[PDB]
Paper text:
Here, we report the use of the TPBLA to explore the role of the protein sequence in determining the aggregation of the naturally amyloidogenic protein, β2m. β2m is 99 residues in length (10.8 kDa) and has a seven-stranded β-sandwich immunoglobulin fold that is stabilized by a single disulphide bond linking Cys25 and Cys80 (31, 32). The protein forms the noncovalently bound light chain of the major histocompatibility complex class 1 (MHC 1) and is important for antigen presentation. Another example is β2m, in which aggregation of the wild-type (WT) protein is associated with the deposition of amyloid fibrils in the joints of patients undergoing long-term renal dialysis (dialysis-related amyloidosis [DRA]). More recently, two single-point variants of this protein, D76N and V27M, have been identified in amyloid deposits in the viscera or tongue, respectively, with the former occurring in the absence of kidney disease.
Residue numbers in the entry: 0 to 99
The structure:
């Protein structure tokens, strides 16, 4: 058996074909087992509609998840990603920094 804690990165991207649009991303990488719970949060509340959830694996024991959706960050509100995994005794919340 192997278990590996996810690395979690939270960032924003504009798709080059539609640069006025902005996407909030949570990239959860290198984890095992694959069982996981991932949410995007706005003011601590689960964003119910997340458009994209892309899961892959490299080696049989390393999984990668890109979880992302369109958003409009203003100076109002706080955004984050929350991850639950067997390796994490408490949920891990990683805040989005507007500079990322």
């Amino acid at each position: 058996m192997i278990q590996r804690t996810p690395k979690i990165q939270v960032y924003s991207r504009h798709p080059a074909e539609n640069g006025k649009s902005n996407f909030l991303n949570c990239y959860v990488s290198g984890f095992h087992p694959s069982d996981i719970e991932v949410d995007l949060l706005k003011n601590g509340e689960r964003i119910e509609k997340v458009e994209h959830s892309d899961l892959s694996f490299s080696k049989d024991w390393s999984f990668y998840l890109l979880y992302y959706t369109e958003f409009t960050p203003t100076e109002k509100a706080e955004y984050a990603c929350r991850v639950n995994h067997v390796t994490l005794s408490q949920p891990k919340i990683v805040k989005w920094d507007r500079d990322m």
